[PDB]
Write an enzyme that holds these catalytic residues in place. Structure first.
Site, PDB file in Angstrom:
ATOM      1  N   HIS A  13       4.005  -0.725  11.307  1.00 57.16           N
ATOM      2  CA  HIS A  13       2.990  -1.749  11.134  1.00 57.16           C
ATOM      3  C   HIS A  13       1.600  -1.124  11.196  1.00 57.16           C
ATOM      4  O   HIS A  13       0.682  -1.586  10.523  1.00 57.16           O
ATOM      5  CB  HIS A  13       3.199  -2.850  12.161  1.00 57.16           C
ATOM      6  CG  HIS A  13       4.415  -3.664  11.866  1.00 57.16           C
ATOM      7  ND1 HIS A  13       4.451  -4.566  10.830  1.00 57.16           N
ATOM      8  CD2 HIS A  13       5.647  -3.680  12.427  1.00 57.16           C
ATOM      9  CE1 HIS A  13       5.647  -5.123  10.777  1.00 57.16           C
ATOM     10  NE2 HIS A  13       6.393  -4.596  11.729  1.00 57.16           N
ATOM     11  N   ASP A  19      -3.561   1.151   5.913  1.00 56.24           N
ATOM     12  CA  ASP A  19      -3.608   1.369   4.467  1.00 56.24           C
ATOM     13  C   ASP A  19      -4.647   0.375   3.942  1.00 56.24           C
ATOM     14  O   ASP A  19      -4.358  -0.793   3.696  1.00 56.24           O
ATOM     15  CB  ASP A  19      -2.221   1.195   3.835  1.00 56.24           C
ATOM     16  CG  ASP A  19      -2.208   1.410   2.319  1.00 56.24           C
ATOM     17  OD1 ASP A  19      -3.301   1.454   1.700  1.00 56.24           O
ATOM     18  OD2 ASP A  19      -1.081   1.505   1.773  1.00 56.24           O
ATOM     19  N   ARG A  22      -4.065  -1.143   0.404  1.00 61.79           N
ATOM     20  CA  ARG A  22      -3.128  -2.233   0.467  1.00 61.79           C
ATOM     21  C   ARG A  22      -3.733  -3.477   1.104  1.00 61.79           C
ATOM     22  O   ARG A  22      -3.605  -4.577   0.582  1.00 61.79           O
ATOM     23  CB  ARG A  22      -1.890  -1.794   1.266  1.00 61.79           C
ATOM     24  CG  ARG A  22      -0.810  -2.885   1.408  1.00 61.79           C
ATOM     25  CD  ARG A  22       0.035  -2.669   2.601  1.00 61.79           C
ATOM     26  NE  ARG A  22      -0.640  -3.263   3.729  1.00 61.79           N
ATOM     27  CZ  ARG A  22      -0.231  -4.334   4.396  1.00 61.79           C
ATOM     28  NH1 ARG A  22       0.916  -4.960   4.116  1.00 61.79           N
ATOM     29  NH2 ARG A  22      -0.987  -4.739   5.392  1.00 61.79           N
ATOM     30  N   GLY A  46       8.353 -12.496   5.066  1.00 60.20           N
ATOM     31  CA  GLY A  46       8.289 -11.196   5.728  1.00 60.20           C
ATOM     32  C   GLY A  46       6.898 -10.953   6.273  1.00 60.20           C
ATOM     33  O   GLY A  46       6.251  -9.982   5.875  1.00 60.20           O
ATOM     34  N   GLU A  68       9.519 -14.263   9.618  1.00 67.11           N
ATOM     35  CA  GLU A  68       9.747 -12.844   9.865  1.00 67.11           C
ATOM     36  C   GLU A  68      11.038 -12.656  10.615  1.00 67.11           C
ATOM     37  O   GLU A  68      11.218 -13.211  11.689  1.00 67.11           O
ATOM     38  CB  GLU A  68       8.575 -12.234  10.640  1.00 67.11           C
ATOM     39  CG  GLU A  68       8.790 -10.764  11.072  1.00 67.11           C
ATOM     40  CD  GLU A  68       9.095  -9.798   9.906  1.00 67.11           C
ATOM     41  OE1 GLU A  68       8.395  -9.844   8.866  1.00 67.11           O
ATOM     42  OE2 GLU A  68      10.032  -8.959  10.052  1.00 67.11           O
ATOM     43  N   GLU A  97      16.132 -16.905   4.025  1.00 71.00           N
ATOM     44  CA  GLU A  97      17.261 -17.533   3.366  1.00 71.00           C
ATOM     45  C   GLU A  97      17.832 -18.731   4.143  1.00 71.00           C
ATOM     46  O   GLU A  97      18.365 -19.658   3.524  1.00 71.00           O
ATOM     47  CB  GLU A  97      18.350 -16.494   3.111  1.00 71.00           C
ATOM     48  CG  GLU A  97      18.011 -15.517   1.984  1.00 71.00           C
ATOM     49  CD  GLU A  97      17.124 -14.344   2.401  1.00 71.00           C
ATOM     50  OE1 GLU A  97      16.654 -14.300   3.557  1.00 71.00           O
ATOM     51  OE2 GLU A  97      16.891 -13.459   1.548  1.00 71.00           O
ATOM     52  N   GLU A 111       4.071  -9.405   0.976  1.00 73.27           N
ATOM     53  CA  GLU A 111       4.021  -7.955   0.752  1.00 73.27           C
ATOM     54  C   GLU A 111       5.478  -7.468   0.870  1.00 73.27           C
ATOM     55  O   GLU A 111       5.987  -7.129   1.940  1.00 73.27           O
ATOM     56  CB  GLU A 111       3.036  -7.303   1.717  1.00 73.27           C
ATOM     57  CG  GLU A 111       2.515  -5.968   1.228  1.00 73.27           C
ATOM     58  CD  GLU A 111       3.436  -4.859   1.629  1.00 73.27           C
ATOM     59  OE1 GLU A 111       4.503  -4.771   0.984  1.00 73.27           O
ATOM     60  OE2 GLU A 111       3.101  -4.109   2.596  1.00 73.27           O
ATOM     61  N   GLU A 120      14.618  -1.200  -0.220  1.00 71.91           N
ATOM     62  CA  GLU A 120      14.502  -2.050   0.978  1.00 71.91           C
ATOM     63  C   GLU A 120      13.346  -3.022   0.811  1.00 71.91           C
ATOM     64  O   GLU A 120      12.565  -3.238   1.727  1.00 71.91           O
ATOM     65  CB  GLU A 120      14.302  -1.195   2.255  1.00 71.91           C
ATOM     66  CG  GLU A 120      15.513  -0.331   2.650  1.00 71.91           C
ATOM     67  CD  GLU A 120      15.319   0.431   3.958  1.00 71.91           C
ATOM     68  OE1 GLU A 120      14.170   0.503   4.443  1.00 71.91           O
ATOM     69  OE2 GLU A 120      16.322   0.963   4.489  1.00 71.91           O
ATOM     70  N   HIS A 269       0.264   4.050   1.319  1.00 74.30           N
ATOM     71  CA  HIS A 269       1.420   4.458   2.119  1.00 74.30           C
ATOM     72  C   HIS A 269       2.730   4.470   1.320  1.00 74.30           C
ATOM     73  O   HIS A 269       3.725   5.062   1.769  1.00 74.30           O
ATOM     74  CB  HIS A 269       1.556   3.530   3.360  1.00 74.30           C
ATOM     75  CG  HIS A 269       2.194   2.203   3.080  1.00 74.30           C
ATOM     76  ND1 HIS A 269       1.510   1.135   2.540  1.00 74.30           N
ATOM     77  CD2 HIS A 269       3.462   1.770   3.284  1.00 74.30           C
ATOM     78  CE1 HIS A 269       2.333   0.106   2.403  1.00 74.30           C
ATOM     79  NE2 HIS A 269       3.524   0.469   2.840  1.00 74.30           N
TER      80      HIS A 269
HETATM   81 MG   LIG Z   1       6.554  -2.420   3.728  1.00 77.42          MG
END
Ligand SMILES: [Mg+2]
Ligand SMILES: [Mg+2]
Lengths: 326, 326
Positions: A13, A19, A22, A46, A68, A97, A111, A120, A269
């Protein structure tokens, strides 16, 4: 004074928030959609430490659901409270889900991108949430992704391979026979390697080989069958060809804001995904290179990225190499 | 076009040879003993790619036995042949504990040192070989090692911990609550961390806490029982104390040549071994720090380094922390 096992958790994190390319692209991309987000509801898929969900609140959103699944959801809830948004931003643990939202949403922010875009990645979860929770005509941020490939002469790899032939110059001992050994070890494998490059490594004009409109019908099935396409390019000059680099960009709808992970652009990153040939191939100016790149789920694990490469260098026969994420 | 599994193998040996401080200290340390090595026989314990064995030949040795247990012995044999020394330098695979030399030797050379001096080190094998194969009055290169400790304020760690309180300045979102989380994750564990520091991190005069004369009677038993000793120092100024750094030097007999891994000296691939407290402790100029450091075998594996730390900061109670290599 107790001992904890969360080094990776904080490091991951930290890397993301540090970053700036980003994080500022998402901050601005969200703010750019203020008119569409003002007084509306958002789902953050997420949400991690929660910073994008807070950006959405700051862009005017009435309500944000920050979903999350990992351990970090607890820290997101504290961040929300610290910024005085506990009544506007709701942190919900577990996978998107099966989460139960009290309402459908006007927008999804996420993101979701992984190494090589799809390693992933949370894309399947974003699309699941789109189908289940997004209102008709609703917004996705970012809205689209594009995939790029270029042939490369990796200057750091070139130095590592040539190191052994240079030992005599520095210590008076010939170790040039270690070069074939080093080449086998560093190139004679089928792993995708995550490494940052720059323009100095790029051997021909980068080629766009796929475009993904995230809201488009059929994308879930394309991801399973494989995303990709053919490419062709011509080399800039004389160099050892080491293989190919793959990278991506994503675009936020508005003049649109683009978050790029190109080696020609500010580093991120994500770096780039490198596909090395088994050994270097010499090329010259205007050497033609063509091929095909396909991004696939691994059979054990659809979340682990597989890349199938077909390539033809100059007059050499077409070859194939089947890679999986390191 | 086959696939090989030897990336780590080449990377490790690349790192060592590219460590100019290390490799030039051994080259010069060996050459400095030309009068003792001229026309004599040498055993190289853990010869790796063979470069130290070739240095010994170049210093005048009549014969060198290069013993290496790992896969890399094959590359050493090719390096020897390439330098035209196949009749002078003999590469022997397998551990030195069971190798059969055709003769006893005048000298043992070895780059045996590990992280924190004793992690996965070859010292026990060097001492075994000394007892079994070294002639009376024979030479060991290097001859001795010294261990050092200093209190530290790790500037990179300080930045990582403080990062979360700085997010508000850069993105307009307060994440300062992530600091306690980051501290638990990065400091609230009992692993030794290998990290390079500089003078900017050193909080008091470094203290020598042990000296090892490698030929001395009883050293094998001391290694099993634990190597170390007490220390005392006084802080330079105001800083967060993060813990302690441990490092070493070794000395080649002759004015003697010293290979140091101090953060005050040129960097090496050994870096330093860091022992973090569970959380930072504020100190001031002339804050007294005392303690004891003991380097021990782990009970599962004598080759994995354990460090037992006792320390007392200022008027605080003495504390203990028991570390094992990451
Ligand atoms: Mg990531
Ligand atoms: Mg070593």
């Amino acid at each position: 004074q107790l001992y904890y096992e969360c080094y990776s958790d904080v490091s991951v994190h930290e890397e993301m928030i540090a970053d700036q390319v980003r994080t500022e692209a998402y901050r601005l991309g969200i703010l750019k959609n203020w008119a569409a987000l003002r007084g509306k509801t958002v789902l953050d898929v997420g949400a991690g430490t929660g910073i994008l969900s807070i950006f959405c609140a700051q862009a005017g959103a009435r309500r944000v659901y920050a979903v999350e699944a990992s351990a970090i959801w607890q820290q997101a809830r504290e961040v929300v409270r610290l910024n005085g948004l506990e009544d506007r931003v709701h942190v919900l643990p577990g996978p998107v889900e099966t989460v139960e939202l009290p309402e459908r949403v006007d927008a999804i922010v996420s993101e979701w991108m992984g190494y090589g875009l799809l390693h992933e990645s949370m894309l399947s979860s974003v699309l699941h949430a789109r189908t289940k929770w997004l209102k008709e005509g609703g917004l996705l941020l970012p809205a689209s992704a594009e995939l790029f490939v270029a042939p490369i002469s990796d200057q750091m790899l070139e130095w590592r391979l040539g190191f052994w032939s240079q030992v005599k110059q520095h210590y008076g001992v010939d170790m040039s026979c270690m070069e074939s050994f080093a080449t086998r070890c560093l190139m004679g494998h089928s792993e995708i390697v995550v490494q940052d490059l720059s323009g100095e490594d790029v051997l021909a004009r980068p080629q766009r080989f796929a475009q993904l409109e995230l809201a488009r019908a059929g994308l879930e099935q394309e991801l399973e069958a494989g995303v990709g396409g053919r490419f062709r390019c011509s080399c800039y000059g004389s160099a050892p060809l080491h293989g190919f680099a793959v990278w991506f960009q994503v675009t936020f709808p508005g003049k649109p804001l683009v978050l790029s992970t190109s080696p020609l652009h500010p580093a991120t990153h994500w770096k780039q995904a490198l596909l090395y040939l088994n050994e270097p191939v010499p090329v010259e100016q205007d050497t033609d290179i063509s091929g095909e790149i396909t991004l696939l789920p691994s059979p054990d694990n659809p979340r682990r990225l597989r890349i199938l490469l077909r390539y033809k260098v100059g007059d050499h026969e077409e070859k194939t190499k089947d890679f999986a994420m390191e």
